[PDB]
Amino acid sequence: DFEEKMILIRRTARMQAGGRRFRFGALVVVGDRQGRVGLGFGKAPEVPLAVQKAGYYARRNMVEVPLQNGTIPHEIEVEFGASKIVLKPAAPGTGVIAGAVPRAILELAGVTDILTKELGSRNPINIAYATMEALRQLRTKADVERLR
RNA sequence: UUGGAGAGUUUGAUCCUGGCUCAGGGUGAACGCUGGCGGCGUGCCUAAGACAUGCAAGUCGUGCGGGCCGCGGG
Ligand SMILES: [Mg+2]
Ligand SMILES: [Mg+2]
Ligand SMILES: [Mg+2]
Ligand SMILES: [Mg+2]
Ligand SMILES: [Mg+2]
Numbered sequence: 039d040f041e042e043k044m045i046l047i048r049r050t051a052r053m054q055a056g057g058r059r060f061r062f063g064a065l066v067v068v069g070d071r072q073g074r075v076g077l078g079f080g081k082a083p084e085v086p087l088a089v090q091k092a093g094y095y096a097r098r099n100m101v102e103v104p105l106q107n108g109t110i111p112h113e114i115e116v117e118f119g120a121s122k123i124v125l126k127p128a129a130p131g132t133g134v135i136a137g138a139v140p141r142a143i144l145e146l147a148g149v150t151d152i153l154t155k156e157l158g159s160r161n162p163i164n165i166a167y168a169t170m171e172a173l174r175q176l177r178t179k180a181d182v183e184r185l186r
Numbered sequence: 187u188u189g190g191a192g193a194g195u196u197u198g199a200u201c202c203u204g205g206c207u208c209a210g211g212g213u214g215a216a217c218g219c220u221g222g223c224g225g226c227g228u229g230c231c232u233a234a235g236a237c238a239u240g241c242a243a244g245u246c247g248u249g250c251g252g253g254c255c256g257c258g259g260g
């Protein structure tokens with residue numbers, strides 16, 4: 039099993055005669071703090087089901103981060119629409135320096151030491167997607183020598 | 187490679203653009219309430235407006251001639 043954290047829980051509305059009627063969403067990451075994270079987005083008529091629905095997707099889309107002594111191997115800059123995330127490798131006693139969104143994403147991934155920065159649209163849902171697709175594009179010296 | 191966190195606010199709801207605003211550190215500071223000791227710094231940022239009084243540049247008789255006073259003694 040994994041450690042699980044709810045990063046976002048929001049309410050949205052739609053309109054029809056008689057007035058507004060709501061729907062809830064939850065951005066949820068899940069991970070072992072040992073090289074495995076997954077991000078899931080769940081929407082439902084009530085908070086709990088959405089949180090649970092989210093968790094199922096989180097496990098449905100996962101990714102394997104090549105941790106090297108608790109930091110990422112190389113620079114990664116990634117855009118997701120108008121959102122940009124910078125992940126920069128950091129030495130031992132550094133700490134995890136990121137906003138509560140990529141913080142929880144990287145944290146549950148076993149990342150213990152990292153310099154980061156959000157640029158552009160800091161919309162919670164998009165910055166999430168950009169942090170993940172960044173990891174999914176992380177490589178190591180092995181991976182490289184094998185390609186080339 | 188010793189180094190980089192963001193949030194609030196346009197919408198019924200969304201994504202984006204965009205500004206406004208905030209949390210930080212800093213100061214020869216000032217103001218309010220309050221105020222026990224000590225150490226080290228430090229204190230007219232305005233009128234280079236105006237200033238009472240004292241003090242801040244003198245020293246040498248191993249350059250010279252003197253006046254006064256004194257010790258000496260003619
Ligand atoms: Mg890999
Ligand atoms: Mg772009
Ligand atoms: Mg975006
Ligand atoms: Mg390195
Ligand atoms: Mg912007």
Ligand SMILES: [Mg+2]
Nearest residue numbers: 159160161162
């Ligand atoms: Mg924003």
Ligand SMILES: [Mg+2]
Nearest residue numbers: 113126187189
């Ligand atoms: Mg660098």
Ligand SMILES: [Mg+2]
Nearest residue numbers: 137191192210
């Ligand atoms: Mg910041």
Ligand SMILES: [Mg+2]
Nearest residue numbers: 194195196197
């Ligand atoms: Mg408003």
Ligand SMILES: [Mg+2]
Nearest residue numbers: 196197203204
């Ligand atoms: Mg409008």
Ligand SMILES: [Mg+2]
Nearest residue numbers: 195196197198
């Ligand atoms: Mg409103």
Ligand SMILES: [Mg+2]
Nearest residue numbers: 160195204205
């Ligand atoms: Mg803004």
Ligand SMILES: [Mg+2]
Nearest residue numbers: 210211212213
């Ligand atoms: Mg201040």
Ligand SMILES: [Mg+2]
Nearest residue numbers: 216217218219
């Ligand atoms: Mg005072």
Ligand SMILES: [Mg+2]
Nearest residue numbers: 218219220221
């Ligand atoms: Mg007083």
Ligand SMILES: [Mg+2]
Nearest residue numbers: 225226227228
């Ligand atoms: Mg003193």
Ligand SMILES: [Mg+2]
Nearest residue numbers: 230231232234
């Ligand atoms: Mg002056």
Ligand SMILES: [Mg+2]
Nearest residue numbers: 232233235236
């Ligand atoms: Mg005048």
Ligand SMILES: [Mg+2]
Nearest residue numbers: 233235236237
């Ligand atoms: Mg006058």
Ligand SMILES: [Mg+2]
Nearest residue numbers: 240241242243
């Ligand atoms: Mg004097």
Ligand SMILES: [Mg+2]
Nearest residue numbers: 246247248249
């Ligand atoms: Mg002489």
